[PDB]
């Protein structure tokens, strides 16, 4: 991929301070707008919406395995576990642990169903059957967000997630049923208000997952996006930063993000 226009992210680079990764695909006409789309950053929890993925592409061989109750225990309960937190005392389905991983970047949640499918390396497996030979999950919630500069640790690329993206909401990798499962799933997301949604007509239907490692400015959002009486557009943005200490910012995400849509 390249960019001959791409001084606008370059400045927004700069003024941020840390990296900036954007991938933009309009699936119509197969344009594209990218911004280090081929360098390496942490998945930080955007790695749930695979793991969703992932999930539903083995109900297609597992019958009723979406509506598994997993009565869980109390100490699956790390921090930032609000959907398993509140129903710890019912248990969750397979499906239900799925959309809270979706939509609430439930972490217990998660971890629950990488333990279903053979932990990081099973859902890295996973990825690589669809042809993303980028992505890669290495660790947990939460040692997977220490987004140390380099690692390539728990990282895959703002294009690779994106041609994976499109591939499982779009393509053919998941069956009608559980493609149509996994849209809804990102359209009910409600972390990314700020993030992609924030760039986007109104209008305009959205899917999204979002990141947030908490550490090294590190943070992200990948979505499907509808526009009117069009093909739909797939992008992911994501961020570092040098310092462990500096901050996130949703807003140059939403800029960003903005800077792709506008560029298509
Ligand atoms: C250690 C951090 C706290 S900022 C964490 O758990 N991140 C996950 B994820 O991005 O892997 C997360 C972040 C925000 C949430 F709301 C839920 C889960």
């Not at 791409?6 to 344009?31: H, N, R, W």
């Not at 959907?83 to 971890?111: F, H, P």
């Not at 290495?138 to 041609?163: C, F, H, K, Q, Y």
């Not at 979002?210 to 996006?225: E, H, M, P, R, S």
């Amino acid at each position: 991929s390249t960019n001959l226009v791409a001084e606008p992210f370059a400045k927004l680079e700069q003024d941020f301070g840390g990296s900036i990764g954007v991938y933009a695909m309009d699936t119509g006409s197969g344009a594209t707008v990218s911004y280090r789309a081929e360098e390496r950053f942490p998945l930080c929890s955007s790695f749930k919406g695979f793991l969703a993925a992932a999930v539903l592409a083995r109900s297609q061989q597992q019958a009723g395995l979406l509506d598994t109750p997993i009565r869980y225990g109390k100490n699956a309960l790390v921090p930032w576990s609000p959907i398993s937190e509140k129903y710890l005392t019912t248990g969750m389905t397979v499906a239900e642990l799925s959309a809270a991983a979706v939509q609430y970047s439930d972490n217990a949640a998660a971890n629950l169903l990488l333990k279903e499918l053979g932990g990081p390396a099973g859902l890295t497996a996973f990825m690589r059957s669809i042809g993303d030979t980028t992505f890669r999950l290495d660790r947990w919630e939460l040692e997977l967000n220490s987004a140390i500069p380099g690692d390539a640790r728990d990282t895959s690329s703002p294009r690779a997630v994106t041609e994976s993206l499109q591939k499982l909401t779009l393509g053919s990798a998941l069956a009608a049923p559980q493609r149509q499962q996994f849209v809804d799933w990102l359209k009910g997301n409600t972390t990314g208000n700020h993030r992609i949604r924030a760039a986007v007509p109104a209008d305009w239907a959205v899917g999204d997952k979002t990141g947030t490692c908490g550490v090294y400015g590190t943070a992200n959002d990948y979505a499907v996006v509808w526009p009117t009486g069009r093909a739909p557009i797939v992008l992911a943005v994501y961020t570092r930063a040098p310092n462990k200490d500096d901050k996130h910012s949703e807003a140059v995400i939403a800029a960003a993000a903005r800077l792709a849509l506008e560029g298509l």
